[PDB]
Amino acid sequence: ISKPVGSEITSVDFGILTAKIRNLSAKQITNPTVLDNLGHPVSGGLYDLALGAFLRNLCSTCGLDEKFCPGHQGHIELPVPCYNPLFFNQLYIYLRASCLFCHHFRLKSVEVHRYACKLRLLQYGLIDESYKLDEITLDISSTLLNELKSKRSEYVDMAIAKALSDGRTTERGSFTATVNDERKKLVHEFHKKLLSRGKCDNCGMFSPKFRKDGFTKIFETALNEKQITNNRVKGFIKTGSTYILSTEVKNILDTVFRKEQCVLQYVFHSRPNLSRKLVKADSFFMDVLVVPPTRFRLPSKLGEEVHENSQNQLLSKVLTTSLLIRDLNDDLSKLRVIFSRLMNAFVTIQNDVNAFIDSTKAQGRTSGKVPIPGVKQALEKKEGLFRKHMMGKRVNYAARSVISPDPNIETNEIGVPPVFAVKLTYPEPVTAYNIAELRQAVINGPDKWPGATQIQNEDGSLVSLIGMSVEQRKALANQLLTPSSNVSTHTLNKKVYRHIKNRDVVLMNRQPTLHKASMMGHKVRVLPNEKTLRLHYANTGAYNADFDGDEMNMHFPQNENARAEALNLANTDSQYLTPTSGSPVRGLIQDHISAGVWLTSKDSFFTREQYQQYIYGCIRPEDGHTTRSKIVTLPPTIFKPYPLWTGKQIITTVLLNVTPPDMPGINLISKNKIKNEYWGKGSLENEVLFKDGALLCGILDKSQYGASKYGIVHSLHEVYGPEVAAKVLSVLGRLFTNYITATAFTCGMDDLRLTAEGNKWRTDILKTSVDTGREAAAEVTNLDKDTPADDPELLKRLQEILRDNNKSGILDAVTSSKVNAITSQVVSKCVPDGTMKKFPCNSMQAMALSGAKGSNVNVSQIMCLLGQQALEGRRVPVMVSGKTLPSFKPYETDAMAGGYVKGRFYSGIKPQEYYFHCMAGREGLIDTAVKTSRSGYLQRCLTKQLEGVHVSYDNSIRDADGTLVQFMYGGDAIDITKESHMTQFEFCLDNYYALLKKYNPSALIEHLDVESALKYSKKTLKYRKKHSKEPHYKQSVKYDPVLAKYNPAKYLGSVSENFQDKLESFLDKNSKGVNEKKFRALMQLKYMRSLINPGEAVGIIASQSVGEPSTQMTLNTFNVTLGIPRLREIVMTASAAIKTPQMTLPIWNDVSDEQADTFCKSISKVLLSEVIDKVIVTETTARSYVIHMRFFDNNEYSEEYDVSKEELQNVISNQFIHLLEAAIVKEIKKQKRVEANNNMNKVQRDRQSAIISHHRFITKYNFDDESGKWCEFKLELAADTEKLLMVNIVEEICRKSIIRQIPHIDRCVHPEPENGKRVLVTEGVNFQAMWDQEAFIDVDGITSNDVAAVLKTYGVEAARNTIVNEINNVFSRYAISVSFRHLDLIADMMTRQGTYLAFNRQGMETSTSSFMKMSYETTCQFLTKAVLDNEREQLDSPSARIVVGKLNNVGTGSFDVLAKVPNA
Amino acid sequence: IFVYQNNITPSAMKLVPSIPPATIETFNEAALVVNITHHELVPKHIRLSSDEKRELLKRYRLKESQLPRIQRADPVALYLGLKRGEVVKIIRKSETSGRYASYRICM
Amino acid sequence: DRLLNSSDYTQASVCRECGSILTTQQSVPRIGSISTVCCRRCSMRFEDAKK
Amino acid sequence: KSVVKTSLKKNELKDGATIKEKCPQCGNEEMNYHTLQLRSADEGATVFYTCTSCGYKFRTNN
Ligand SMILES: [Zn+2]
Ligand SMILES: [Zn+2]
Ligand SMILES: [Zn+2]
Ligand SMILES: [Zn+2]
């Protein structure tokens, strides 16, 4: 920190190096061999000593040694100008668009000019005048075109000058993401008109079309003999696919770029080109290579063998082929076959420079195990450069080890081993106050722990203390304040690198870091006698760690700016609530839970010696736990027989001592997890009660001091602050450890046993399960009457069910839900009642009821039975033979044979049901291995877009370049980790005085206006209740909300309108030393102190609050796409074709259920295949085909599908026979390369002969007009055609002819009404059609989940409301609460362009930051788009500031600290 | 405003920008069967004059190309007939704060 | 601290005129001088002393 | 026209699973439980608690 930097980098320009790289490097490289004998580097070779010092030789350029040479660049002269393979697609577009006769493009002189004149406007920040340029129009002569060109260009000289005379644009031009969209639409369109033309327009003589291959060649295909005759009519006024040599592309494109300089001055420049350079075509080819410096091209080594570098093997091969084409360059100076090797050399001088840059753009020779990587393969992967060594560096001053538990250190502490404590050092500058301690550190030296390893002198020279003795350290600790002779370093002072101490801090890290609470900041507490990092149990739920061998990374920060941020921003005390939903994550975990159900029990009675021992066991005044410096106690609750204290009265005493004395006690009314009936008749131990800081009723659980919301530790966090709530977890961590050591807790075999009364109960209920398998199987086969299992008419149906995946799904669901009832009858009769040991003594139940460990499902499977072993949602799989195991009869309708385990883990499971339980055990393990890979990439993909998104100082949520995303954070600007008790008005009234001197208003009413926002709020409250019966579109807009008028942190009373409604609803239904006027003043100051802070990274948090709970929903089927694959269509990929799109149609309240079910059938599509029983085709042989149809009975398809027989006549005779002959003719063209009814009337005869005339070969036709049971016709083909699979043709056409299809809609269904909502669910989306159904549908309430189809019909704000409703449906299914403030910020990012943009490459394409895009994926693809743009990176996104090493602009880099000097 | 029945021949679409002061908006009457702004998911859109547009950009210190965007062919931008450069004000009911005023510009 | 100051913090020499890191060079001095820092592609060779 | 039950009806399959956990929103005792295994062979099962009458989704980790 004593070597400051002055000048700093602020923006990076991309460009192309010209031909005069030769000026910066006169150290050309010719000899391809890198060394010679005697190990020396040969001159002119790739290890030349003018490229940097090498092999203990000085540099020929720097004159410096290997430690201090920077290294320098050389260059390889390519003999012929090969093209750069990055820019090869972007010259093949300009090659395929230029006319070889006139050297323009194949667009007109005015249409080229128009894109040249709109892109000039868009390199300024003005988009409106570009669309108003096409407004300038009016036997075309070339004088009226040159008027228009001087008329359009006159407008652009005025529109730019007007906006520059205003403040709309600057001289360097305005450029934003929405301007980037409109430029990437013209240039993509400009490369679509130029690409698709045939002839020139300033002449007629036109060029032959081109061709290419895999990036090595370009061909000029033969212009056919029609078009040369179209050329020579004008020019008067060779073989097939001739090759194009690389130099003759340059001689075309040099002359084109000289002519179209105007349009290409704005295609290639997105800011105004102040340097007024020229876009030249040499920039696409490669005149020279450049050799990287020798330091970047060092030899490789492994074991004891040195090898040559990768970047020399690809780069000598260019230089031998450069030599080999000079070897053959002498074979024309004295002068067929040698041009077959000359042209062979140009392909391989191209294919070597192509294989130098890329490696996938070559051909190679053989399977050389993915051959030698080029310079693009060093950049584009997970590994490589831009993601492994710029976003993912390795660090100094860091240690990792296995973690171990400790309840004796604090919650905000780590136990550093003495192995790590004598290695990690901190550079501490020696001053007048730490000289007494840094002298002692140097005396101890680098072996004794309060010590130091080396000192740093004022000239920066280090002096290591390791080899020194006790005398060279004492005689060097005495010189720490001696000023040096030098005057340049008279400012500085020495730095002693002391060891880590108990006042240092540390970033700690669990390695899958899915959210920001997995990397917190601890205080060091150095322990003896260990080698393991050592942690407290409050932290192990935050890191998601357990003590099974997990390792954690310990980082030790090396300056005072970072120590002020591991103590104040990332410490564990401020990480009590997670930002995902506002729920606490820090609390006591397993056995401190199960000790508070015994300590705070009603049986606990401690004597005087014991009561004072549990106080001082956890609260020590010496270590600063108290607030009074004298431990105060309580009177006993029993006086006369013997003085005894209650166990609840200890929890009172520990809160009496650790809370501040001036504040009054806590007041809380909460619940437990333990029901009242486990304690006896008339107990009240479910009600937790704190009155004035005294626990008066109820035991303490996971629900009080665990990681649970609105407990006692969560409530102390609100009233007293995070520093007190972190002490109470430490005090209770020591209280329930000394009580455990004095009074232990065990779990034995007797805990797991049912009594003989209750063990007869589970036998009698499981006796009634032997019939359950058949009865569910007799139900799905639609038999009855208890048909026996060996019935041959039953076993035939079970085989029919077995072959279908549908029917086996029904039989599984019926039988599983029928045997889960018997599972639920055994549990609901036994587990409180049939057990041998009742609740307090039965520790197996008390670990499950308290929430200490396990559930009631674990206790039921131990004591009662396992239950149904459901596999992939369905049931146990089955062989081909109808056997689920070889032990069972085929098609066995036993419940046990389907996988129902009637055994428990106490008594044992049989070998058959041990095999099904291993099936269920493995699907929980293969699904885990595929779990984390799914949601890992979903979180990475969010944290690049939503990554420079932060709260600004005007409370608007903005991106890094300044583009606005939201206007407040969620509409209320409230931090999620603050709004927990904000709507808990009963809690804030019971603790009014203790909460008053926290939100202290007395020292605050002179820095903020008070009455301006309260006055405006009552106008907007009174006006809004007068208009509440109106719908939302008839809402008058006089009074915009008070947050949009007043800053919430500047004006008291400016308050989100939902908080104001809840606050007035509380004060008007609750009349309770506290007024209502002063309670308004508290809860409006509390809104003002719970606001989001400016600089808060709400983009990372919103992405970590979605990707992290999505590692929790990887499971299978429990109709709509569920869980992560639904979440990968909305968020990722922006699917315009959802797999299962739906539509929810709210029917009216006067349309009946029959008229609803009738309306369902009038929507769903009806194929012609859905009314056919059989199709009998008789082929006799001219050829014939008598196609006979059998429909179902007319009272069956008119009832199931609402299809009359007059429809089938019109469907077959207008649609089917046309489609049928379009398939028969198509096949032949790809081949020659009961009863009887006759005596038709006049209607049927006229129907026949007309349709014969309308078709080609049908010749007979009849349809059942009386009953609607059969159609009948006779396709006669020719007397020449061979065999035709007619029945395979007819089955494909019957399944594609529709009788009645409203388009894009497959099926309507009437589900169960959820909460009275009579709705209809439609498999498919068509909003346009459902508007025509207003007699049955509330069309102003129809709701889809195809976001791309709500966007097209209803617009961008309706689509944005769909996204927040469809991400919510994913998480609310899995009972996962995420806050809507995260979901609104994800939705307002995806709708930032008016469109529905994804989080992927294609959504990221319209952005400003180039390094954000390069670091994500396809690095050199985005690099191509940036270099051609000559794009100035502004270095504002956090992915671009870590590259250049600039300070990040989010959080503590969102402002500047300026020091105020007193003298003039 | 010109309300047609089935379609417009694209030879006749060229006459729409043919007048510089006056604009022409087209609507198919099949689309106009339901007023889309009566739906429960479409908030209240209000176009701002250039008096309170200019005072909006002063409050947040914005360029015009930094607001959230609404497309020119959006069915709500076609409903209000928004020209390019007009900031519409969206009053949407947030699920956390009740009423909430947002803005969005037509480009 | 983590991604710059404790991993690969180096202070380099950058020409303010061309804006490049790689093409700088500490000059081999004349024997009566001090080795200064000079950029190479902004530099013109001394034979180009044209009038 | 097949001879087995090819589809489930609208209200002819109710969940058999029931365990007497108190529903923290309306006070119901019956509750359909649902256990699927998330993590590897270092962590147990995680139970999904869906109530009967109201239908509030609830989740207990361990
Ligand atoms: Zn050197
Ligand atoms: Zn031409
Ligand atoms: Zn320079
Ligand atoms: Zn309930």
Tab-separated table of C-alpha atoms in Angstrom, chain A residues 835-965:
chain	number	residue	atom	x	y	z
A	835	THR	CA	-45.552	-47.084	21.925
A	836	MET	CA	-43.964	-48.478	25.059
A	837	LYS	CA	-42.297	-45.275	26.256
A	838	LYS	CA	-44.490	-42.185	26.158
A	839	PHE	CA	-43.346	-38.755	24.955
A	840	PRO	CA	-40.776	-37.159	27.326
A	841	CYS	CA	-38.985	-40.412	28.095
A	842	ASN	CA	-39.206	-41.645	24.478
A	843	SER	CA	-36.297	-39.767	22.974
A	844	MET	CA	-37.005	-41.114	19.504
A	845	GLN	CA	-40.258	-39.157	19.475
A	846	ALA	CA	-38.771	-36.150	21.240
A	847	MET	CA	-36.131	-35.835	18.540
A	848	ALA	CA	-38.936	-35.845	15.981
A	849	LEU	CA	-41.489	-33.654	17.741
A	850	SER	CA	-39.017	-30.950	18.718
A	851	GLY	CA	-37.668	-30.727	15.206
A	852	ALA	CA	-34.251	-31.686	16.543
A	853	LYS	CA	-33.685	-34.361	13.908
A	854	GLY	CA	-36.018	-36.320	11.676
A	855	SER	CA	-39.737	-36.283	11.090
A	856	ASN	CA	-42.816	-38.244	12.022
A	857	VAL	CA	-42.331	-40.224	8.818
A	858	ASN	CA	-39.013	-41.591	10.075
A	859	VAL	CA	-40.639	-42.657	13.346
A	860	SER	CA	-43.491	-44.345	11.497
A	861	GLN	CA	-41.220	-46.411	9.261
A	862	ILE	CA	-39.225	-47.560	12.269
A	863	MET	CA	-42.174	-48.427	14.472
A	864	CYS	CA	-45.049	-49.292	12.123
A	865	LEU	CA	-44.144	-50.119	8.461
A	866	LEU	CA	-42.313	-48.703	5.462
A	867	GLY	CA	-45.241	-48.392	3.083
A	868	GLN	CA	-45.460	-48.189	-0.672
A	869	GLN	CA	-42.109	-48.095	-2.478
A	870	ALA	CA	-43.007	-45.666	-5.239
A	871	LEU	CA	-40.600	-45.740	-8.183
A	872	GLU	CA	-40.381	-42.813	-10.657
A	873	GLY	CA	-43.719	-41.729	-9.233
A	874	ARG	CA	-45.559	-44.820	-10.359
A	875	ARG	CA	-44.848	-48.119	-8.534
A	876	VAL	CA	-42.401	-51.104	-8.728
A	877	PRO	CA	-41.515	-52.051	-12.338
A	878	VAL	CA	-42.437	-55.317	-13.946
A	879	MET	CA	-40.803	-57.822	-16.293
A	880	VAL	CA	-42.126	-58.897	-19.677
A	881	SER	CA	-43.780	-61.922	-18.055
A	882	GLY	CA	-45.992	-59.975	-15.691
A	883	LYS	CA	-43.707	-60.716	-12.760
A	884	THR	CA	-42.340	-58.070	-10.437
A	885	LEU	CA	-39.836	-60.585	-9.039
A	886	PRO	CA	-39.180	-64.272	-9.714
A	887	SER	CA	-40.715	-64.980	-6.299
A	888	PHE	CA	-44.244	-64.057	-7.337
A	889	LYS	CA	-46.925	-65.558	-9.551
A	890	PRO	CA	-47.294	-63.754	-12.895
A	891	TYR	CA	-50.047	-61.127	-12.772
A	892	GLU	CA	-50.233	-61.361	-8.989
A	893	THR	CA	-52.801	-59.012	-7.468
A	894	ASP	CA	-51.132	-58.941	-4.086
A	895	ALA	CA	-50.268	-55.610	-2.552
A	896	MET	CA	-46.930	-57.062	-1.437
A	897	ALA	CA	-46.115	-58.119	-4.994
A	898	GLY	CA	-46.506	-54.548	-6.175
A	899	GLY	CA	-44.024	-53.213	-3.667
A	900	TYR	CA	-45.977	-52.571	-0.465
A	901	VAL	CA	-43.740	-53.226	2.525
A	902	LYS	CA	-45.695	-54.415	5.562
A	903	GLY	CA	-42.491	-54.617	7.554
A	904	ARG	CA	-40.683	-52.073	9.680
A	905	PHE	CA	-37.047	-51.402	10.421
A	906	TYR	CA	-37.501	-52.499	14.030
A	907	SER	CA	-38.443	-56.084	13.196
A	908	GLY	CA	-37.075	-56.529	9.703
A	909	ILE	CA	-38.041	-56.614	6.053
A	910	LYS	CA	-38.465	-59.808	4.018
A	911	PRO	CA	-36.142	-60.586	1.059
A	912	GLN	CA	-38.723	-59.611	-1.556
A	913	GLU	CA	-39.419	-56.258	0.077
A	914	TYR	CA	-35.727	-55.747	0.723
A	915	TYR	CA	-35.288	-55.800	-3.040
A	916	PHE	CA	-37.946	-53.197	-3.769
A	917	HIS	CA	-36.554	-50.983	-1.043
A	918	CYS	CA	-33.168	-51.059	-2.758
A	919	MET	CA	-34.930	-49.958	-5.934
A	920	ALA	CA	-36.334	-46.922	-4.151
A	921	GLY	CA	-32.990	-46.324	-2.472
A	922	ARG	CA	-31.163	-46.106	-5.784
A	923	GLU	CA	-33.546	-43.722	-7.514
A	924	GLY	CA	-32.854	-41.274	-4.724
A	925	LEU	CA	-29.150	-41.523	-5.490
A	926	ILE	CA	-29.129	-41.376	-9.283
A	927	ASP	CA	-31.413	-38.348	-9.091
A	928	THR	CA	-28.937	-36.648	-6.753
A	929	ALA	CA	-26.056	-37.146	-9.201
A	930	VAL	CA	-28.153	-35.451	-11.899
A	931	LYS	CA	-29.536	-32.808	-9.504
A	932	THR	CA	-26.706	-30.312	-9.112
A	933	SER	CA	-25.687	-30.156	-12.775
A	934	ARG	CA	-29.132	-28.852	-13.742
A	935	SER	CA	-29.526	-25.878	-11.416
A	936	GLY	CA	-25.830	-25.012	-11.470
A	937	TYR	CA	-25.948	-23.673	-15.005
A	938	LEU	CA	-29.263	-21.917	-14.380
A	939	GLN	CA	-27.675	-19.838	-11.632
A	940	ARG	CA	-24.494	-19.075	-13.600
A	941	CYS	CA	-26.585	-17.858	-16.497
A	942	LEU	CA	-28.574	-15.389	-14.384
A	943	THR	CA	-25.464	-13.948	-12.697
A	944	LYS	CA	-24.045	-12.429	-15.840
A	945	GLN	CA	-26.999	-10.328	-16.914
A	946	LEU	CA	-28.231	-9.572	-13.388
A	947	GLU	CA	-24.749	-8.857	-12.177
A	948	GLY	CA	-24.020	-5.129	-12.437
A	949	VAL	CA	-27.570	-4.338	-11.413
A	950	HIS	CA	-27.587	-2.280	-8.226
A	951	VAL	CA	-29.629	0.207	-6.230
A	952	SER	CA	-28.770	3.746	-7.224
A	953	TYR	CA	-28.851	6.777	-4.966
A	954	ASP	CA	-32.194	7.956	-6.350
A	955	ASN	CA	-33.575	4.511	-5.370
A	956	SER	CA	-33.935	3.382	-8.978
A	957	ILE	CA	-32.597	-0.046	-9.880
A	958	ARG	CA	-30.128	0.464	-12.703
A	959	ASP	CA	-27.692	-1.608	-14.686
A	960	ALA	CA	-23.954	-0.921	-14.792
A	961	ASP	CA	-24.029	1.277	-17.891
A	962	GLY	CA	-26.837	3.353	-16.404
A	963	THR	CA	-29.779	1.790	-18.230
A	964	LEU	CA	-32.786	1.771	-15.984
A	965	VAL	CA	-34.457	-1.467	-14.937
